[PDB]
């Protein structure tokens, strides 16, 4: 788009444009991102409270400050199919997704207990994990995320199935290819054991076993573009969520069995609003068509019809540069504009 850019000396920032038309970015944050929206999005209770007051569907749940009150929380939530998260954040850590029994509630608690001290005992909702990207109060992209997994591709064991699919030419390293490698570790085993499987067991034809609790491309999962399959009412709701929180660029984490039906019909929920979301899954999906995510960002920073540059008048030659430069700056100044100039004597502004 012919917008000039520079790196700045502080905080890994990049400047776009010159003079009075400059904008700054830092990864996925920009000069238009407000602090209040960003801090609210990082406060899980604040986000939940503000959204349920707006009539937006969120999961049902409560708080326990590391006391054994688990037996009571479960009853307000509605039963054992519950989710237990660490009280503070530590990325995707210390989280139990589907507690079915009391002894699991205890194990889940012990992991939650690792972090600092109402994200305890939420109702578990069924459906897929969808990420929705909204840029200026308008929807840009939608993708479905699926955890690393193998399927019953013949009468083979899980460790055999993993080697078979982990040789796929689209997998390896990181930001080198579309997908990364599937790794068997103690955590793949812990996830498989809960499903009734382990690495040396044979799967029934077309049976699917997950090797991870959550979906992430960096851990070997996949991302499917579903941008054109989202229902108009759901589009309206996602845009309303971004505006209520106050974010310009926002990722919204949605759980639903069918993104093509209204969330109220499928009993879906909005799990989280994410400030400064990444773009990899939308610009390099493993299935479906790639989206030009940057274009909507540059359109808000430099709206159609506006300049990104200021006039530059460059004066050279063997003799007379300083004299010509001061006169030309003087003439421009008579129009009432701020004029900056450089010479062999000094740097001046107005």
């Amino acid at each position: 788009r012919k917008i000039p850019w520079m790196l700045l000396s502080a905080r890994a920032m990049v400047q776009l444009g010159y003079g009075v038309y400059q904008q700054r970015i830092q990864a996925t944050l920009s000069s238009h991102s407000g602090i209040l929206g960003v801090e609210l999005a990082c406060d899980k209770e604040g986000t939940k409270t503000i959204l349920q007051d707006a009539g937006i569907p969120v999961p049902r749940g409560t708080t326990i400050q590391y006391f054994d009150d688990l037996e009571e929380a479960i009853n307000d939530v509605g039963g054992y199919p519950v989710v237990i998260k660490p009280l503070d954040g530590n990325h995707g850590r210390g989280i139990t997704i589907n507690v079915r029994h009391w002894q699991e509630a205890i194990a889940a608690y012990d992991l939650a207990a690792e972090e600092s001290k109402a994200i305890i005992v939420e109702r578990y909702y069924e459906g897929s994990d969808h990420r929705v990207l909204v840029v200026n109060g308008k929807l840009v992209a939608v993708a479905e995320r699926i955890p690393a997994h193998v399927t019953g591709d013949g009468s083979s064991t899980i460790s055999e199935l993993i080697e078979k699919t982990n040789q796929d030419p689209n997998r390896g390293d990181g930001h080198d290819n579309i997908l990364t490698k599937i790794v068997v570790n103690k955590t793949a085993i812990d996830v498989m054991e809960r499903q009734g499987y382990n690495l040396d067991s044979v799967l029934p034809k077309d049976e699917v076993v997950y090797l991870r609790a959550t979906a992430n491309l960096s851990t070997g999962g996949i991302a499917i573009d579903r941008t054109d399959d989202i229902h108009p009412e759901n589009i309206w709701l996602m845009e309303r969520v971004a505006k209520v929180i106050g974010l310009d660029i926002a990722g919204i984490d949605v759980v639903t069995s069918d993104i093509s039906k209204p969330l109220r019909e499928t009993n879906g929920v909005i799990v989280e609003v994410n400030a400064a979301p990444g773009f990899r899954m939308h610009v390099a999906p493993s299935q479906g068509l790639p989206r030009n995510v940057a274009a909507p960002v540059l359109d808000m920073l430099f709206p159609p019809g506006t300049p990104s540059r200021i006039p530059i008048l460059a004066v050279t030659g063997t003799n007379g540069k300083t004299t010509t430069t001061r006169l030309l700056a003087h003439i421009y100044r008579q129009t009432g504009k701020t004029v900056g100039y450089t010479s062999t004597d000094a740097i001046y502004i107005n």
Partner: peptide
Amino acid sequence: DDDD
């Protein structure tokens, strides 16, 4: 992050 930087990249949520």
